[PDB]
Design a protein around this ligand. Structure first.
Ligand SMILES: COC(=O)c1sccc1S(=O)(=O)NC(=O)Nc1nc(C)nc(OC)n1
Ligand SMILES: COC(=O)c1sccc1S(=O)(=O)NC(=O)Nc1nc(C)nc(OC)n1
Lengths: 349, 350
């Protein structure tokens, strides 16, 4: 189950821009300590890894990690089982995994000075944000409170340290620049399928509207809904009657309609409440967020699309967290992704 | 195919690090976003590790450790897309580990809710960062004597400059002790292994070996900081500008330094390091004196009974290598010399 035969593998950087410091660089002057004088800095570039099987079939898959993550989540589970990278190379697809700008091997744009500041210009904010272990526990629905697990959980219990160690902060890079890097990758690859997660859900939807080479999207537990500009439906607050979900992203309808040209599937795990849950903020957040996504998919279908919502429990899989592709039943989750690719001819040459 | 690779298994994991905690308690009924330090536990300073194991490995696993401001990408592929040492050594029947050290790449960058690196009143890492420029890295890596210029003999993959410089970035001020600690813990997990280091990781790998008997050999590409027994740093001249110096050598207790005499150690240097003072080109002159300091470090190890050697690639007939010989155009020939070292000491046998 672990063996993999690669026709080729490797990695590369793509995307990004340059910014410059004042003055001119003099090679006769001390180069250390590093200074901004005469400096050119490459910023906001993306890291890309690929593994190609012998005799690929169908389209390459681009796996795009969620917020605060890296391509690690597609390589292995926290307990060391094969991730989707291995499983899909075995399924005869070329697999790309990225570390988006600002994450992992992608660039973090900082210089000589306070974090993110190049002389007088703020490239990214000096003040950061980052989830705690406790916040991520409830966000990912391991259980209702830190330390607790839902009954029949598919989380790899005992590997909490491994799991939380994979997560971290992201600097305040413009989402436009993150989308731009992936558009450039899609142009380089050719026709492909995006597989997104959490924060990358909305970003992958945006990429597809700019890149006809995106031939399909599967989004695991996307975090932000998307609608045509001025056509956001009524969405209730959370059960605390104070909080809201993430403000839906609005795009021009001419771009939104591109989403109707390709098959799109949103995948949700288990333990999202049907009814208001005022005691557990992130559980209720998921209830309302999933509802908003259902309306987003309906809007795509009203433009002639083929957009679906797969709740894993309806397919017979119980206990999944917000990372179904690293849960204990991730082979079964992968089988459902293979089913989607096959139905839509994305596994054929 | 030169590009084909057969893996018995591959994967990645996190190892090492500690935790820090914010004030107060976490209440799951209160808004979790925007994220707060209240009731927060943060995992910090952990390391990312990738492994690829061939079918029927022969010899010891290799642990490739990137230089300063880099990641494991440099062992995966060259900037022009040719196979890196990860592929070459899995093809040479070694299990290959590649790391992103704490503070780099997929390793942790310890920051929270607040100014960079600050957890309430505690500074975990500095808010003020440092970072090389393209121009500084060009001359540091000896692509040529000045930015935009190549040595005539260069092995650099010209035309892929943007790709190359895009792989580099800043490092937060994590203590070197905590970086060494993470790799010691990895070596404990792996068992007997060989460290292959580069530039800033050279001195760190030397330190790891003094703490971890599982390190059975070291090959260091263009190490940046020399190491000596405490109180026994030899006289090292200033640079040709008469004012600058090389990196202050790291000093360790002699009982630890002596552990370096128990394993084979090779330092590998590329080309275009001047023999004579060169005041017009600061980093060329810096490499001249740094290489000299390393020669004295290796001699100190050998006087204690060691097996330490310096390989200048031009003496092996390879001309034009930069400070990243393992991504240069002749990196297959560089890899052959690494295979030769492993074979000489039986590190390629079970
Ligand atoms: C891995 O988990 C995530 O990725 C998820 S899932 C629910 C929440 C989160 S998260 O951490 O909160 N990330 C984000 O989705 N980040 C984010 N945050 C804001 C305020 N706006 C936007 O864009 C609209 N994205
Ligand atoms: C590939 O890049 C490097 O790795 C190299 S090589 C020559 C120089 C460099 S570098 O940038 O300067 N790195 C470091 O070696 N980092 C570093 N820098 C200072 C000021 N002190 C200490 O501590 C001993 N380490």
């Amino acid at each position: 189950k672990r063996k993999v035969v690669l026709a080729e593998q490797g990695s590369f950087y793509i995307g990004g821009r340059t910014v410059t410091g004042p003055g001119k660089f003099d090679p006769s002057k001390p180069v250390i300590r590093y200074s901004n004088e005469g400096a050119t800095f490459y910023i906001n570039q993306m890291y890309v890894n690929f593994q190609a099987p012998v005799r690929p079939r169908g389209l390459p898959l681009v796996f795009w990690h969620g917020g605060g993550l890296t391509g690690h989540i597609w390589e292995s589970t926290p307990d060391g089982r094969p991730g989707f990278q291995t499983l899909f190379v075995q399924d005869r697809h070329t697999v790309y995994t990225i570390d988006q700008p600002g994450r992992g091997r992608g660039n973090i744009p900082t210089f000589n000075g306070p974090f993110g500041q190049l002389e007088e210009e703020s490239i990214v904010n000096t003040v950061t944000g980052n989830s705690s272990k406790e916040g991520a526990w409830v966000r990912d629905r391991l259980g209702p409170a830190p330390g607790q697990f839902f009954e029949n959980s598919q989380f790899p219990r005992g590997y909490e340290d491994n799991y939380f160690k994979e997560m971290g902060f992201s600097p305040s890079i413009s989402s436009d620049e993150i989308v731009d890097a992936v558009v450039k990758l899609v142009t380089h690859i050719g026709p492909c399928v995006l597989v997104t997660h959490a924060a990358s859900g909305v970003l992958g939807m945006r990429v597809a509207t700019h890149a006809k080479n995106v031939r399909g999207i599967v989004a695991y537990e996307p975090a932000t809904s998307i609608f045509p500009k001025g056509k956001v439906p009524e969405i209730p607050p959370l059960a605390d009657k104070k909080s809201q979900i993430f403000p839906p992203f609005e795009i021009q309808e001419s771009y939104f309609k591109k989403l109707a040209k390709i098959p799109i599937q949103f995948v949700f795990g288990d333990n999202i409440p049907k009814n208001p849950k005022s005691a557990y903020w992130f559980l209720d957040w998921w209830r309302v967020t999933r509802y908003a996504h259902s309306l987003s998919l309906e809007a795509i279908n009203k433009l002639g699309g083929q957009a679906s919502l797969l709740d894993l429990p309806t397919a017979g899989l119980r206990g999944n967290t917000a990372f179904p592709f690293t849960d204990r039943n991730n082979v079964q989750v992968a089988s459902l992704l293979s089913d989607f690719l096959g139905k839509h001819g994305l596994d054929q040459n």
